[PDB]
Design a protein around this nucleic acid. Structure first.
Ligand SMILES: [Ca+2]
Ligand SMILES: [Ca+2]
Ligand SMILES: [Cl-]
Ligand SMILES: [Cl-]
Lengths: 290, 290
DNA sequence: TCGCACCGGTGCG
DNA sequence: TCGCACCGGTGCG
């Protein structure tokens, strides 16, 4: 019952008023410092939410808003996937694959992953797209997970599994991206994944935009290197059931692949996964990689 | 002070519990039955929100959630733009232009606007995109406003201005789409507009997806009819200031226009408007149409 | 200071 | 019954 000394919430000052802030990572640690989560993802998210809700209540404080939990639930789901993806490549012994949880585009633009030769190809494109009366760009939010196949990137440190959630464990999973800055050959990036706790008819179109933009960058790289064999695939994943409507929407073409009558149409999002249990995270990775 | 007899909120039964529901149209009528809104849009939205908030408070009831107001504010902004667009074409005497507020994709798929010859061209595309091992589609939410140039579509009934907000006035603005079912030639549709009370780094990419998909449908129509002169433009509009970041994101290419080194890159969203006052709605329409 | 990216809770047909 | 499309309120660097 010692909820009163929890640190999953945090008081702070704003306009002479004490304000409340959820600490999402702290909530993870306090519930999982002995054992990372198992069973139903959706149920674990609610357990985390009802924990903080009990911490505030016993502390005498105001309930955080629905917006605060949306932000927080998004992080819980991402950290859960990241950690389970870290452990997947260990127990499967995939010594040439990395599954990386990416930060936001300002912290680390995903194009920074690539080597010099490829970063300049992309810069040739970027620069040429601005050299017109009407300036154009190619912008999107960072993919949530990147799957990279490149042997020389794996170090022995990565083969140690994460059995418990600590500030230090979460930090290595969430800074792994740093190790690969500059080192990737263009055709080593093999897939990306967009993660959402839930979908909505509007928010689900964000996955399509993302895949469309990434594949467009990649189609350009296929051309510059004149390599028709290399592929980049993009995927969505939800913590809820995926309806038929969600399915139809996520069948939307990568529009540059439908210009001519003889082109093979390509989907922007190759597939959408409904992650009910942690087991399903393993199942999804099986399809993506193999 | 007679807030107690307002109908902008409405009690209803759910699991033996009386629940509260905002009636957004009713709020509009009760505040604007003598005079449609003028001045600052953003301020009028807050006036509508503080009206309902005062109605519930004086009635003794629970405050509607932040989600309820998001849904409601979205409608207020749309009805305001629609009505002001109705009056724009009247006072400007544009006898060959319609600016139509569109409903959702299930109520009225926007492709229903087109004549038979064009609806079959689109069906040839739709059918061909499914005739592959990997089924693909072209899906998006309905554009908020359509701008259509076709003389034979204007009737004298449309030239009467809307000076006050009544259930009957709002209804004609919101059912105008019905009049044009089947009657549009492909190159009569000249622009679309996506309307948002506010932007966010994720929600703003929805405008890009939309414009990308619409222009892709249109590029196909340009090809089938072999007409290089016809254009379709797509625009965004916010009720808040538009930052530089919002601007950069909305400079994103329509990806099918950047495949070859000699193609002229096209933006998915041709421009983004910050609508501070009702006057700005008139200004935007001036740029779009002329 | 603000930009990024998160997602639930609606009103309505 | 649910699918559509709406958008604010965050935690954090
Ligand atoms: Ca995501
Ligand atoms: Ca809109
Ligand atoms: Cl195991
Ligand atoms: Cl006037």
């Amino acid at each position: 019952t010692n909820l009163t000394n929890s640190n999953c919430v945090e008081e702070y000052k704003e306009n002479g008023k004490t304000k409340i802030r959820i600490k999402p990572f702290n909530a993870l640690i306090e519930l999982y410092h002995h054992q990372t989560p198992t069973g139903s993802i959706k149920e674990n998210l609610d357990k985390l939410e009802n924990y903080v809700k009990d911490v505030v209540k016993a502390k005498g404080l105001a309930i955080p808003t629905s917006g605060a939990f949306s932000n927080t639930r998004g992080t819980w789901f991402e950290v859960m996937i990241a950690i389970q993806s870290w452990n997947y490549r260990v127990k499967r012994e995939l010594n040439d694959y990395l599954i990386i949880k990416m930060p936001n585009v300002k912290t680390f633009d995903f194009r920074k992953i690539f080597d010099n030769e490829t970063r300049e190809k992309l810069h040739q494109l970027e620069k040429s797209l601005l050299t017109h009366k009407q300036q154009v760009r190619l912008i999107t939010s960072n993919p949530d997970l990147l799957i990279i196949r490149q042997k020389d990137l794996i170090k022995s440190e990565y083969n140690l599994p994460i059995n418990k959630l600590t500030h230090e464990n979460i930090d290595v999973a969430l800074t792994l991206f740093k190790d690969i800055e500059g080192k990737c050959k263009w055709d080593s990036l093999v897939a990306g994944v967009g993660l959402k706790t839930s979908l909505r008819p509007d928010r689900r179109l964000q996955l399509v935009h993302e895949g469309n933009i990434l594949k467009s960058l990649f189609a350009h790289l296929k051309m510059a290197y004149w390599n028709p064999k290399a592929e980049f695939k993009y995927y969505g994943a939800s913590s809820e059931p995926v309806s038929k409507a969600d399915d139809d929407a996520l069948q939307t073409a990568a529009t540059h692949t439908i210009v001519n009558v003889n082109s093979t149409p390509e989907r922007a999002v190759d597939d959408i996964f409904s992650l009910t249990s942690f087991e399903d995270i393993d199942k999804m990775l099986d399809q993506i990689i193999k």
